Ligand binder design. Sequence first.
Ligand code: HEM
Length: 387
Amino acid sequence: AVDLGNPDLYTTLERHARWRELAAEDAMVWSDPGSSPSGFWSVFSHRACAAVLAPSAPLTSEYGMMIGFDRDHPDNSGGRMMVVSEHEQHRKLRKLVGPLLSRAAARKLAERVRIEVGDVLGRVLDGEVCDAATAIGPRIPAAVVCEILGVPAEDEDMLIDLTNHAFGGEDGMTPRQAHTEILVYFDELITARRKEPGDDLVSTLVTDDDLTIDDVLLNCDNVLIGGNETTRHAITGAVHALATVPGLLTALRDGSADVDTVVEEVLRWTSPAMHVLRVTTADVTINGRDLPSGTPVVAWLPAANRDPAEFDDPDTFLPGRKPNRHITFGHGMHHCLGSALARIELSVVLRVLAERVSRVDLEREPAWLRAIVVQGYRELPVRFTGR
Ligand code: HEM
């Protein structure tokens, strides 16, 4: 019996070896029920994952987009939250949230990323020692999401800390409790923005009278989860790359390496979103297997981002890797709405660390989170030297 939803398979970097085998073969593997309530098929190659997530492909996210959910066991947020909705409800929310996460919105948030990195490099610029998976990685995305939601500056530090714990190590607050506390604050913020609307995500969501208080809350949560759960590990990955890849930090400083090109390589290299699930809407043949309607199909994104048919020497971090057609942000109609924001966050992080820090050195091997939703760092012990 095979179960690819087992988190123990991905606790070590050997997950890449398992993925490499399945990606090069372009395999369709069936997983038996266990972590999944009904089981699921899986694709691994770049071409197979792109075909599953295609706009014209008869698959849906309305029942959920992660292992644990299917047609018979649907996501409770299904049809209400953007990432688990389809058709006009999905199009509406993507239209309402869209411009607040656009390239233009990302550019005005670039200053905050610089300030937040600078404030971090005020206590870690010492010799030893700091974890990069905490108080470095989660700090930047949390600050950005705060300004998107339009939270008062007075409450930012409270919200940063709760966001940090909500998507970090599972084990006196619990990540689930911290998540709840944010949603409790969200409800209080929703109430205040009903009386006095401004220029923020909460205000934009509440002005639409067709959306209920539950719809506003769930889509605020989509931005909270979306902007934090994955992004933190990409930032930690950027620090990890600067610590391991020789000459990279210097190359960014002098300008021999292109900043936007390395951002795309960090994205491909880290691939924080480990999987995306889809449910078939009609009878379809994927790869070479005939699947009925209501069948769960899963695309393993880090496997696709290291597919040798698409990426030459995929295990090496290449600062000038071109072309780089990674699907770290997924593909098709649900392509990450905050992709420009994720790119601007990484861009500024790599810039400021090249400007202020002379050398970043790794203390010991990183630990990984016991999870399947995210390819995440549990810890990254590093030494910072600058000034
Ligand atoms: C490098 C970090 C990030 C990664 C790896 C990532 C990954 C993804 C992926 C793979 C999806 C598609 C899910 C699916 O296909 O079912 C997605 C959707 C989404 N993400 Fe991101 N994301 C990142 C950063 C962000 C940021 C910064 C934001 C904004 C604050 C954000 C907000 C969203 C939203 C709102 C959706 C739903 C889009 C839709 O359903 O149309 N994400 N993300």
